[PDB]
């Protein structure tokens, strides 16, 4: 079922994988190793930058600005190499799995991520250079799609849709998961709850994600990337071809699967589009009894008529892009 989560918010694959991997790990009552937690937080923020490049610059394209979209898609084209180097896919990695990550990062990856990191600040500034002070950008977004703080909570808004309204709320600050409680980052919060503040909060998260990524590169520990229990995670191919208990466990994990102790859970993470959650019900068997995905954009598109009725047709275009919808997660 894990590749299904790659295809919900399909610009934020490894983050979708994480919320499903953290729900199963909670029902498995296992503690994934420190190197996996640092890989998942670093690729969690590489994913956040990838989403924001698609989200913010698709939104600017709708308002009429074409050039920032082209610049930012070279950067994301750069970052899908990091995906395609640790997994074998540019988009649907299937990398983050309950128990850690599928394989370990290759021996040249951390240096190339740091090399990209030394120039990504300039990328944020040149897209900052065409929109933040542009008077046509300001008059297309300032005062548009305004939602109050008390209504944003009542509308099930999360993420920038909520933080735009002045509420300090981050799921990685309030319920730390993986290695987030081991890093420093700031939380962008707007004050007017409009498309302009939401744009300023997302352009700040570019800088905060790049700040987190640097700390992960510095604090990357050694050790396994898979929980060291072959009853849960697949054994190394060497061990499976060398030892009997490794072969039996490899055979059972790929035919039956592992059994998840019975129960249910709601697990939520700060996805690039908001609180992404999953409600997983467990039989005690090897197949989930119920998997429900709580998609941030489902909760956001529902409040569309609340914030848009009374604006013009162009202002509706402005509000679709600030609300950052991907319909793989909306429809599921």
């Amino acid at each position: 079922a894990l590749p299904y989560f790659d295809r919900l918010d399909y610009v934020s694959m490894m983050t979708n994988e994480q919320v499903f991997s953290l729900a199963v790990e909670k029902l498995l009552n296992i503690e994934i190793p420190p190197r996996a937690k640092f890989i998942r937080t670093m690729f969690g923020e590489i994913t956040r930058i990838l989403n924001h490049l698609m989200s913010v610059l698709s939104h600017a394209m709708d308002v009429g600005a074409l050039t920032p979209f082209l610049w930012g898609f070279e950067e994301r084209e750069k970052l899908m190499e990091f995906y395609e180097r640790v997994s074998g896919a540019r988009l649907h990695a299937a990398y983050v799995r309950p128990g850690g990550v599928h394989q370990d990062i290759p021996v040249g990856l951390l240096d190339d991520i740091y090399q990209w990191a030394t120039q990504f600040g300039d990328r944020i500034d040149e897209t900052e250079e065409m929109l933040t002070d542009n008077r046509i950008w300001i008059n297309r977004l300032k005062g548009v799609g305004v939602v109050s703080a008390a209504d944003a909570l009542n509308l099930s808004f999360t993420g920038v849709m909520l933080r735009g309204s002045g509420v300090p709320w981050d799921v990685r600050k309030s319920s730390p998961y993986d290695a987030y409680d081991q890093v420093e980052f700031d939380v962008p919060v707007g004050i007017n709850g409009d498309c302009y503040d939401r744009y300023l909060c997302r352009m700040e998260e570019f800088r905060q994600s790049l700040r987190i990524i640097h700390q992960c590169l510095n604090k990357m520990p050694a050790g396994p990337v898979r929980y060291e229990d072959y009853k849960i995670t697949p054994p190394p191919r060497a061990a499976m071809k060398e030892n009997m208990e490794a072969l039996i466990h490899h055979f059972l994990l790929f035919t039956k699967g592992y059994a998840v102790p019975p129960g249910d859970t709601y697990t939520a993470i700060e996805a690039p589009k908001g609180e992404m959650g999953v409600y997983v019900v467990s039989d005690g068997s090897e197949r989930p009894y119920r998997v429900h995905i709580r998609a941030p954009g489902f909760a956001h598109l529902s409040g569309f008529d609340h914030i848009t009725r009374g604006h013009l047709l162009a202002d509706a275009v402005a509000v679709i892009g600030t609300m950052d919808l991907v319909f793989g997660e909306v429809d599921r």
Binding site: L110, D125, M220, A222
Partner: protein, 60 residues
């Protein structure tokens, strides 16, 4: 060995907002230089029309 950071760690990157005000786009020099172009242009225009009206007197 696994893929590790270098001994002392990587050096810091640039992430803080950096949009430094350049004198090419300041509203005082642009207004002033506009006024010089606009005042010189009217100077030549006064010379031109005065000459053309005199050229018109000769043709008539």
């Amino acid at each position: 060995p696994q893929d590790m950071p270098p001994p002392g760690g990587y050096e810091a990157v640039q992430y803080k907002r950096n949009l430094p005000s350049r004198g090419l786009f300041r509203p005082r020099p642009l207004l002033a230089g506009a006024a010089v172009l606009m005042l010189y242009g009217w100077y030549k225009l006064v010379k031109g029309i005065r000459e053309q009206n005199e050229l018109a007197r000769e043709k008539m």
